[PDB]
Amino acid sequence: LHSEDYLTLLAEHIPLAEDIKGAHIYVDGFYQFTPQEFRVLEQLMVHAEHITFSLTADKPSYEREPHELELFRMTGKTYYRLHQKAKELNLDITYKELSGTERHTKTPELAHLEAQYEARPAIPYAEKQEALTVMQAANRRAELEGIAREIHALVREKGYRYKDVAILARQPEDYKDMV
Amino acid sequence: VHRLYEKELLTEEQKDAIDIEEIVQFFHTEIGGQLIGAKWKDREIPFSLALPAKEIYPDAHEADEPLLVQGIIDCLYETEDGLYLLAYKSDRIEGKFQHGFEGAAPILKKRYETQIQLYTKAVEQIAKTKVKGCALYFFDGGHILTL
């Protein structure tokens, strides 16, 4: 059994399985699906009782795919295809959009960054700087030790715990050993 | 079983090695009889349970996050009186104990006591329904130990 035949085999046994029939299904965290995953998704759309697709996008349209330069290109395309197949199988469809921002209600700068990310031309931010910091390091070693000091400050003085902090890299291999 | 072999749920190698009598025997017993004659029943029930770190480790704190403990419950059935838990063990009993099962029974209870207490804590916490009784069916000798 090829390791990629699981999703295929799953898709053709879902109608056969009884437990699926009355199930509620929530899918989230995905940006896009492989066709092989999509087959599973539509099969769930058929034999499950209900299914909710959570997608990160801004008023995506189910009529046409996004323009390539659109921020929400991936998710937008996903929405278009998912909605298309939902209408294809005559599902009763319910749409809910979350206009409000709940994550950055506490902090303004990041809400400004999230909202004005794509915007052209971008509107400047006139308030004080506190929570958004751009940092320049002499090297990667200094970058890491620096962030170490900042984390230590953040846990000693600002009542953060270590679990609240996250370090991301585009090319982790550049940093892991030194981290 | 050849409905199962055909659908490849069990490999034919696994199929060849099965005491069919041992399987059937459980259903003759009174607890198994309760299972078949049950208002409600469910099998292979997976679960996740949060437990404060203090319980497993001393010095831990409430602010400190709970540990996650997962497991699979073999069987759960609901009679008119209450909700009961059921587990099966392919343990070896008849072969090597001086008092046989009665030598095994205190020891077996010990061997799975912690596990059962965790399982019961799971159903008790999550479903918020106390479980009346728990049963351990052993294939070897067909014995059923009540906990």
Binding site: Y6, D19, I25, S54, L55, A57, Y79, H83 | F47, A50
Partner: protein
């Protein structure tokens, strides 16, 4: 039926789903199966979060699945697990 929950990053979609499932666990701990389908590198996180209810402190009716893990359970029920599988190597 289908429900398209859509919003920008920071909309609160994931917590909305977490809470939905939690409430549905409250209403009926033995109700019909609830499947939380997330990317493989996101299965544990959600498992933790769902488990963090003072009300229930865990889940039973509702599981977190990857596509692979879901395939494992449904195939355990439906069959076809007998054959060995091959790693990429």
């Amino acid at each position: 039926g289908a429900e398209f929950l859509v919003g920008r990053s920071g909309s609160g979609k994931t917590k909305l789903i977490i809470n939905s499932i939690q409430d549905e666990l409250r209403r009926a701990p033995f109700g019909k199966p609830i499947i939380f389908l997330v990317p493989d590198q996101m299965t544990f996180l959600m498992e933790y979060e769902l488990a963090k209810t003072p009300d229930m402190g865990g889940m039973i009716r509702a599981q977190v699945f990857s596509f692979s893990r879901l395939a494992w359970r449904v195939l355990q029920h439906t069959g076809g697990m007998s054959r060995p599988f091959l790693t990429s190597t």
